[PDB]
Amino acid sequence: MASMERFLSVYDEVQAFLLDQLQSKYEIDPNRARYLRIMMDTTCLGGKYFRGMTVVNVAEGFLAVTQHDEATKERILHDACVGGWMIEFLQAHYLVEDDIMDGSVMRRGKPCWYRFPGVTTQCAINDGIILKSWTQIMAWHYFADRPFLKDLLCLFQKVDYATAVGQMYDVTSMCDSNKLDPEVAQPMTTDFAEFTPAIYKRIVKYKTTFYTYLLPLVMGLLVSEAAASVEMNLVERVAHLIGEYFQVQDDVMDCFTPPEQLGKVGTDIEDAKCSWLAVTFLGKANAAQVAEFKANYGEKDPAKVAVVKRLYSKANLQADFAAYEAEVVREVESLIEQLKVKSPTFAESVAVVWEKTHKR
């Protein structure tokens, strides 16, 4: 059967298992089960499933070149789908909690979960906690007998932790590090000295690349029992490179994509985020442009936001983006070539992952 329909069918199976277990082992009543069903659907469904489907696609690649009984092929594909849903539910956790943390209004054209009338922040924080707990229930149930259970749980933990650390890097990126202090309300930077390429790269590496690219690629290897088919250092390098490019695209869209195509109103400027646009602008601006940026960035005032967007537009950041893109293309192709030494099949799966990202 087609990959996406298998993946969606496994969602229904996993959902039924989780809710049936709540009834048989956690004393849940039907109305609370219905609440949790709706919560799961609303927070986990509706995206493109790129992360989860990467697990499936990696596993499919190895199936095409490896000898297996049919029942083993089916088991591997089912495991890849469950692992993919673990990643989708991990993302759902972070999106629920991040939307609360950031006071976000919409996501994908619909209200953020905490804003639903019968949810509220009091429930939504805990709903997000449940979403991540479900990833572990999935693993322990479906992968109980599997040789890769330990490695998969360990990997998942490290990626989850890296993501939380990256969230810290993101939410504090507009403050001066030397002034961080739980006792003192945090002012926005005035010098923007920490708006550098290396600091930006650290935010992005931790907040998105581990869970968006590294985890799906490695989970695909694990469910395929194929980690020996790769040089793991290369997998990490290519995941972090593609993931950075993905986030750069998101940063550009936050400012310039119309809200109707973006699914929300972008507020990176008002939030004073260390975005690719801000770092790149500061890397080419003259003194007068720097001063005008400082007088306007990080303010909710629409007039000041408009000034910042004007500065970005006049700064010809399309030039810098094309130069960045051309360099990423160079480096990603080089890493794919190196991956071919040990596994042409995995290299091809990464090439597919890159094509989908680049042409998004």
Binding-site residues for Mn(2+), in ranges, read 98, 102, 170, 250, 254
Element (H, E) at 4: helix 3-25
Partner whose binding site includes residue 63, from Zn ion, a second copy, none (CB under 5 to 8 Å by kind): none
Residue tagged 């306007």 (tokens): 296
Q: Are the C-beta atoms of residues 149 and 141 closer than 8 Å to each other? A: no
Which residue from 10, 19, 22, 95 is in contact with a second copy, where contact means CB under 8 A? 22
Q: Does 118 bind a second copy (CB under 8 A)?
A: yes
User: Nearer to a second copy by C-beta: 122 or 286?
Assistant: 122
Query: Nearest-CA neighbor of 292 among 315, 318, 311, 273?
Result: 311
Q: Does 250 bind Zn ion (CB under 5 A)?
A: yes
DSSP labels, 263-302: SS---TTTTT---HHHHHHHTT--HHHHHHHHHHTT---H
User: Nearer to Zn ion by C-beta: 223 or 248?
Assistant: 248
Please choose, out of 59-67, 72-80, 97-105, 235-243, the segment that lies near Zn ion by the rule CB under 5 A: 97-105
Task: Give the end-to-end CA distance of the chain in Å, rounded to a whole number.
Answer: 26
Integer Cα distance of 222 and 228 in angstroms: 10
Query: Nearest-CA neighbor of 276 among 250, 304, 305?
Result: 250
Q: Does 31 bind a second copy (CB under 8 A)?
A: yes
125-144 residues near a second copy, rule: CB under 8 A: 125-127, 129-130, 133, 136-137, 140
Q: Does 97 bind Zn ion (CB under 5 A)?
A: no
Q: 106-107 and 110-111: which strand pairing? A: antiparallel
Integer Cα distance of 293 and 287 in angstroms: 10
Integer Cα distance of 353 and 360 in angstroms: 11
Nearest-10 Cα torsion for 6, 53, 137, 133: -140
Q: Does 190 bind a second copy (CB under 8 A)?
A: no
Please choose, out of 11-19, 94-102, 206-214, 277-285, the segment that lies near Zn ion by the rule CB under 5 A: 94-102
Please choose, out of 24-32, 64-72, 81-89, 215-223, the segment that lies near a second copy by the rule CB under 8 A: 24-32
Integer Cα distance of 282 and 290 in angstroms: 7
Q: Does 350 bind a second copy (CB under 8 A)?
A: no
Which residue from 60, 244, 254, 271 is in contact with Zn ion, where contact means CB under 5 A? 254
**Smallest separation, CB 230 to a second copy (Å):** 21
How many beta carbons lie within 10 A of that of residue 336, not counting itself? 20
Q: Does 102 bind Zn ion (CB under 5 A)?
A: yes
Q: Does 265 bind Zn ion (CB under 5 A)?
A: no
Q: How many residues bind a second copy (CB under 8 A)?
A: 61
Q: Are the C-beta atoms of residues 30 and 75 closer than 8 Å to each other? A: no
DSSP secondary structure code for residue 214 in this structure: I
Query: Nearest-CA neighbor of 156 among 99, 83, 97, 239?
Result: 83
Binding mask 59-98 for a second copy (x = CB under 8 A): --------------------------------------x-
Annotated binding-site ranges for Mg(2+): 98, 102, 170, 250, 254
Please choose, out of 42-50, 109-117, 252-260, 307-315, the segment that lies near Zn ion by the rule CB under 5 A: 252-260
Partner whose binding site includes residue 153, from Zn ion, a second copy, none (CB under 5 to 8 Å by kind): a second copy
Which residues lie closer than 8 Å to 88 by C-beta, 6 or more apart?
Answer: 44, 47, 49, 51, 52
Partner whose binding site includes residue 304, from Zn ion, a second copy, none (CB under 5 to 8 Å by kind): none
Which residues of the chain form contacts with Zn ion (CB under 5 A)? 98, 102, 250, 254
Give contact residues for a second copy (rule: CB under 8 A).
22, 26-29, 31-32, 34-36, 38-39, 42, 97, 100-103, 116-123, 125-127, 129-130, 133, 136-137, 140, 150, 153-154, 157, 160-162, 164-165, 167-169, 171-172, 177-178, 180-186, 202, 205-206
